[PDB]
Ligand binder design. Sequence first.
Ligand code: CLA
Ligand code: CLA
Ligand code: CLA
Ligand code: CLA
Ligand code: DGA
Ligand code: BCR
Ligand code: BCR
Ligand code: OEX
Ligand code: CL
Ligand code: CL
Ligand code: NA
Lengths: 30, 37, 35, 31, 49, 50, 44, 32, 449, 238, 336, 61
Amino acid sequence: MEALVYTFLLIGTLGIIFFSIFFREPPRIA
Amino acid sequence: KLPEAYAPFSPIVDVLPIIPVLFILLAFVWQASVSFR
Amino acid sequence: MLTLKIFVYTVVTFFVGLFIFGFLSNDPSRNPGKG
Amino acid sequence: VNILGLTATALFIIIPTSFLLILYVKTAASE
Amino acid sequence: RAAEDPEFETFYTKNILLNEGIRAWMAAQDQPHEKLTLPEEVLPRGNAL
Amino acid sequence: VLGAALLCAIHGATVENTLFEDGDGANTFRAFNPTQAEETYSMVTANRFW
Amino acid sequence: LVDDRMNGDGTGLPFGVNDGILGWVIAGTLGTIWAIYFVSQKDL
Amino acid sequence: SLTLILQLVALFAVVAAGPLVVVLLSVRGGNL
Amino acid sequence: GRDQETTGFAWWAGNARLINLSGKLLGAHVAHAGLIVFWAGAMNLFEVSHFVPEKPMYEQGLILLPHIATLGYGVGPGGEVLDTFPYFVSGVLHLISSAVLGFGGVYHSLIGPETLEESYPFFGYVWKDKNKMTNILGYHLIILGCGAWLLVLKALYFGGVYDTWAPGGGDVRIISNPTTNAAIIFGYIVKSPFGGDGWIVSVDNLEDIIGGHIWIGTLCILGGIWHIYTTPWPWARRAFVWSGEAYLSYSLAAVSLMGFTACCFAWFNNTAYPSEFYGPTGPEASQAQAFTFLVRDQRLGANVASAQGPTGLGKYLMRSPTGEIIFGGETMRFWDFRGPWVEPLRGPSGLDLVKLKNDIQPWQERRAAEYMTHAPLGSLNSVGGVATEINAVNFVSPRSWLATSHFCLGFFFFVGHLWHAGRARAAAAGFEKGIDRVDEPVLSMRPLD
Amino acid sequence: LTYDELQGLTYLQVKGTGIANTCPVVEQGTSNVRELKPGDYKLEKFCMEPTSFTVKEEDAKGREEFVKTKLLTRLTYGLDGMNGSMKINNDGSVEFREDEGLDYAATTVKLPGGEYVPFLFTIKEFDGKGTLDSFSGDFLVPSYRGSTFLDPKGRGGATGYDNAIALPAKADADEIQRLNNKSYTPGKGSAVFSVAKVDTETGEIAGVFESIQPSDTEMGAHPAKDIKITGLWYGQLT
Amino acid sequence: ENTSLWARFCEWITSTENRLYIGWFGVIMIPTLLTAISVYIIAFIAAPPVDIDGIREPVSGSLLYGNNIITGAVVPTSNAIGLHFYPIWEAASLDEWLYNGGPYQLVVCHFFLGVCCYMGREWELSYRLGMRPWIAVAYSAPVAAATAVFIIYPIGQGSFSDGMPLGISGTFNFMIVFQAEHNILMHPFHMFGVAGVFGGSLFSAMHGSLVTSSLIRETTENESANAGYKFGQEEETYNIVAAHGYFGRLIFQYASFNNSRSLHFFLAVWPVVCIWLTALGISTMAFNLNGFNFNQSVVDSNGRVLNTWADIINRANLGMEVMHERNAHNFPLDLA
Amino acid sequence: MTSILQIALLGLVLVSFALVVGVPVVFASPNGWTENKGVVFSGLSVWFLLVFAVGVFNSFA
Ligand code: CLA
Ligand code: CLA
Ligand code: CLA
Ligand code: CLA
Ligand SMILES: CCCCCCCCCCCCCCCCCC(=O)OC[C@H](CO)OC(=O)CCCCCCCCCCCCCCCCC
Ligand SMILES: CC1=C(/C=C/C(C)=C/C=C/C(C)=C/C=C/C=C(C)/C=C/C=C(C)/C=C/C2=C(C)CCCC2(C)C)C(C)(C)CCC1
Ligand SMILES: CC1=C(/C=C/C(C)=C/C=C/C(C)=C/C=C/C=C(C)/C=C/C=C(C)/C=C/C2=C(C)CCCC2(C)C)C(C)(C)CCC1
Ligand code: OEX
Ligand SMILES: [Cl-]
Ligand SMILES: [Cl-]
Ligand code: NA
């Protein structure tokens, strides 16, 4: 049960990392 | 120990290894004397 | 295990060869500089 | 404990996530 | 889990043992007001060290 | 503390390596004048790199 | 012995090649990449 | 002691040598 | 000297000012070589003046006298020093030669020609002159091959060198029949660097060492002639960067690798770094403690073959993962250690039980006890032992000093290689001073990075 | 490999090969076995090499059997260099005694399911009676852990806390088999040896063995399992 | 039209239009780091216990074996293996490879290769963008530190069991045993490293606070001040002169950094050189050079030892030493 | 012969110190090298002579 929670939290953090990398707001040269 | 004929020069032997350390400090002295030109 | 070792040797050799011949492929010319 | 820690973790995730999602979605609708 | 299973070891349990060693070997000289004169036989130690 | 040391090192390196030329000479520390109204390093290039 | 193992550890083995097929696949992979790079040179 | 005195004399001589060279080149012309 | 206005280099980069001054660069080099030979001679004279005959060299904080003793000067059987006059002569010769080198360096730095290209075309060079660069490299390769052959001549005809593997506890030996087999020689260079293999640090006999030096000398001379009579091929001319800073970066990477390797030689090798002069290695000291506590309890009547520790593995003897009989305890990690005092006790299966029961020599026992008490563990204020031991003995192993210093030097020279390789690439490409601010490349690139 | 050619190789070319864990094989000789001179012999260079580890196990459906394992430790399970004496009579009766040597090897196997079974593969103090084709006997199986072994909480038999001290109010009356005592009572194991090959020119004997012994009890804890070791054995006489 | 296969592959590899730059350092970096990441995640979740000390006494390490995020670790390789390079194909079975600590060596070797090629890739992208190349030199300091704790210290100690465990409580165990055996707190290189991290925090806070203090008014109070900066604006967003004037009036009008480039060079060089020093300290204590041993340094006229704070530290270190590896030592000296 | 060697080595130390202090001074002096040629050559020659003399007298001391 607790291993489920730990693995879920770790993969959720990694998903946030993935989204922040590949779906970031693009910096605009303007 | 040094050879017996060279034993009285042991005091000046004991100072020599620091002279390479003194050279880089001498470079800094020369640069200060030219005001770090 | 020997099959695994052969496969890993092939993989490592492939990537190392890519590295070596990539820097052999006129790499100092791959810059945006002038001259 | 096994279940009170579970609900504490779930609430600590979801409620600030809800707050952040509310603010982000209104901002992104405002471009 | 460690109390009901003698084969369960983690780095956390190793650190707990190390903390016990720190306290026991430090207290006598580190807290003189405690007046702790603990004989060597009661000090937690490992094998041959 | 460790992230702040990382930030200090990485920001100093990024600024020092994204500098504009701004003057002839291999000593870049003389290419900055404190009374100037332009950036001395390329934020666009630093952002692209990182 | 109760089980099989390569027993290649130690012994000062050249590139860790306990079977000549390993040296052959190393040479083949390196030579294939070299051949691609060589027949593909003067193309930049 | 004689050993310590001679070590100190040698130390002072070697320490003063290079600075004396720089001082002499400063007061005697230049090109340093 | 020069200023920043005419060179573009500040005083803290002032040596860069003489990148394109051949004569002054030569003067800096020759003065520096004089400095190196000065340190060699002065440190050697310091070590012989502080040398005390009854104690072994490693107890006296000496790092150069072990080198000359390994060359085989002034020592006898068992590493016992017979005369320190060869060491004194080495120190004096270095200290005198340093004066000539210093005079040459000071001359070429101060009043020599700034550039050698005009009046001395043999010595004149530009960094882009790849033929002249290969000529200089060839001359230096020939000199290095002659140095390796000097080591070979000393080993074969000029008294030999110290063999720690000689029977009875090592002695100075003439090396007859060096290992010239190419398979054996280049196996070392293609060995793994890990435990049990050790790459080239695991060379364990003077025959292999001297045969490898014959190979290195001949290859260096042949490559020197090759570089004198050849020009770099077009693939090399496209692969490399042809400038003084780039050449310096290549040398920095090479000497960083050499410094790390020398660190590992000092820490692990007991053949080229005999324990009689350098003290035991770490593995040697651990195995010596295990052997001493084996022989003591054997003398106390205990059976060292059936005795098991708290874990059940065996207090004195256990098995390596490949089955060899090895010393028990944590020194199992050092089960691949080989030393002159333990290899007579090893049969094909490892530590032989009947040899450990009956065939233990007094010199082996004395070396084991000595090496147990002089393990390479100490503090940087030279307090011997583990960090918890009190200030009683004054000992840090020369192996420890050499390994620590040369790992540090190898790491800094790796960093310097990175610095100079990057700056050489950036200077060749033309943006070592910064972005042009009018032709910025990223502004010409497609967005979204 | 024969013992002669094993001694004909050096430590450098044996190192890393695994041969150091392998018993010598009597390549010469004959299999008559009874064509051996009877008498009193000094058993010397006794060596034992397992070829299989099996663990007695009980499944859900009610079937007991010796299941196959995966050897977790490396080639450290060999016994060699043991000494003793053995008595051979003209009728074929044999008595077998092992005095001392490398007569113990800590081994760990993995059961299907991921369970670790550590045991002490030992043949020490082995009394064996029988015939030349088979003799059975008993040997002492010591405790896996010595009395000074400490658990991850520091508790142990001849050294330690004797209670869980991380719990200021929980060490009493329920973890008695965990903290109140750490038992190191020794066990016994059964073995059957069988001579197969013999050479009377040199006195070397060899054969197969089958042993059943208890595993580790974890210092008075979770009950031991029965380990069945089949393997080869070798030795020299007088 | 440059139709060659290798030319097309090379143009894709060295392309600056990829979202993440690959380069020739990246073609080694990406597979090694992906291998290390995969094995680390799988081992951290579900690896069986590892006999780290080689005394047949395994350490669990993984979540499925009862660890939390703090106590979970990838356990270092068995002491019986030492430095002997244990890959999967050198094991009789995956179970033996897991029991003996093979995942640790796999992850450490691939991580070392990946971070070296990460540094090279940093140089490569700086070169392809027309930048100055020394961000890789700055990144060499954490690379040196990781190499020291994962490779160099196991080399000097003779066993990968002495590597830092890939975990949090494992890291704490590594630190505690390291202090017990080497007195790292009394090591000057470690003191320089502590000064470097503390100074890096101080200088990061100082520089950020000065730049934020001298920000020029471009927005309103209802808007975030960050909105006063636009990405790619030519002009400076803060008053360097005002920030320098405040700093000079704060401590000393001299000993300042009115040159912005000199200031940023200082910010780069201080923590990097100090982390270099402390990584070298770890690497030297790998060969047992240790921190300052001042035990029983102060004695009175009659020779009685006057204990000091160094002696109190020594008592703590004795408690640390007599408890680590409680069953692994058979002989009094901890030479191995 | 030992006293002769000691006197020669003392003179060598003095000449070495004189060369160390003077050769850079003469080299970097304005037109100092073109005027002190004889003095510098005499110092170098007496230095080499003293080195050879000490080396010879070592075999007799
Ligand atoms: C074979 C050695 C070698 C060579 C020949 C040079 C040559 C060059 N380097 Mg250098 N460099 C190298 C190694 C080398 N370096 C290494 C090992 C590093 C350190 C990681 C660097 C880092 C580097 C930097 C950062 C820079 C140079 C630059 C230069 C140029 C000017 C140097 C100058 O004026 O310094 C003058 C000398 C000083 C200012 C003295 C510095 C004080 C030092 C740190 C004292 C250290 C003493 C310490 C006790 C030693 C022990 C430490 C440790 C081992 C325990 C010159 C062409 C410059 C350049 O790029 O110009 C084009 C430049 O900025 N180099
Ligand atoms: C290993 C040490 C080393 C070496 C061999 C050199 C070599 C050189 N440097 Mg220097 N330098 C060094 C390190 C070194 N440096 C470091 C550490 C720094 C940082 C401060 C610098 C920074 C630097 C700058 C800023 C510049 C150089 C330059 C020079 C060159 C011209 C010398 C000159 O005109 O000085 C003149 C100096 C003097 C007149 C005073 C010293 C006189 C001598 C040399 C003292 C030696 C005493 C010695 C014991 C006598 C031996 C006598 C013999 C018979 C035994 C010279 C080749 C210059 C250059 O590039 O030239 C174009 C330049 O501008 N250097
Ligand atoms: C490869 C280098 C090397 C090695 C391995 C050693 C090894 C040895 N030497 Mg030796 N020595 C060397 C170079 C070396 N030395 C040099 C270059 C000199 C000239 C100073 C000497 C002169 C010397 C003497 C005069 C003596 C020794 C002694 C010793 C012994 C003890 C050393 C000790 O106590 O250190 C103590 C530890 C240190 C001093 C730490 C040094 C820290 C580094 C170098 C500084 C780092 C820079 C700093 C932290 C950051 C600032 C950067 C920049 C601003 C500068 C040891 C066997 C002693 C002995 O027993 O001889 C018989 C002795 O009395 N040596
Ligand atoms: C402060 C600077 C410093 C100091 C004082 C030293 C000092 C030392 N280093 Mg060094 N080192 C340093 C910088 C330094 N290092 C740096 C910057 C690097 C690169 C990172 C290295 C790389 C390095 C390596 C690779 C090695 C040393 C080693 C050594 C030791 C012996 C050096 C030696 O024998 O020279 C060698 C001298 C020469 C090469 C000059 C030519 C000598 C000729 C060929 C000798 C001929 C002898 C002949 C056979 C005699 C017989 C004659 C006749 C009868 C035939 C010595 C303690 C060695 C050591 O002990 O390992 C731990 C070693 O292997 N160092
Ligand atoms: C474990 C087994 C492997 C052993 C490892 C060591 C092998 C020896 C490698 C030494 C190569 C010496 C450097 C030559 C120049 C390298 C740069 C280059 O190339 O520069 C390029 C340069 C440009 O013209 O080329 C040239 O000058 C000509 C260079 C000759 C290239 C050598 C190729 C030899 C044969 C390769 C394998 C046969 C390949 C066939 C495979 C096809 C599919 C089966
Ligand atoms: C360029 C330059 C530089 C550098 C310089 C140099 C590096 C120099 C040097 C030099 C050198 C490197 C020198 C050496 C020397 C030597 C001498 C001078 C000697 C001698 C002799 C004697 C006299 C001895 C005696 C004795 C004996 C025989 C034995 C017994 C003891 C005794 C000691 C007595 C600088 C940085 C500054 C700055 C810039 C410029
Ligand atoms: C004496 C001795 C010996 C011998 C040794 C030897 C024989 C050695 C050698 C060796 C060798 C024979 C080596 C070689 C090497 C090589 C190297 C080290 C390399 C390299 C290079 C590089 C790094 C490259 C890079 C690149 C690429 C990758 C591509 C692109 C371009 C370029 C070119 C940049 C012995 C041990 C026996 C014994 C003891 C002593
Ligand atoms: O693993 Mn971690 O801690 Ca370095 O000492 Mn030996 O090993 Mn173990 O004991 Mn002490
Ligand atoms: Cl621990
Ligand atoms: Cl131990
Ligand atoms: Na212990």
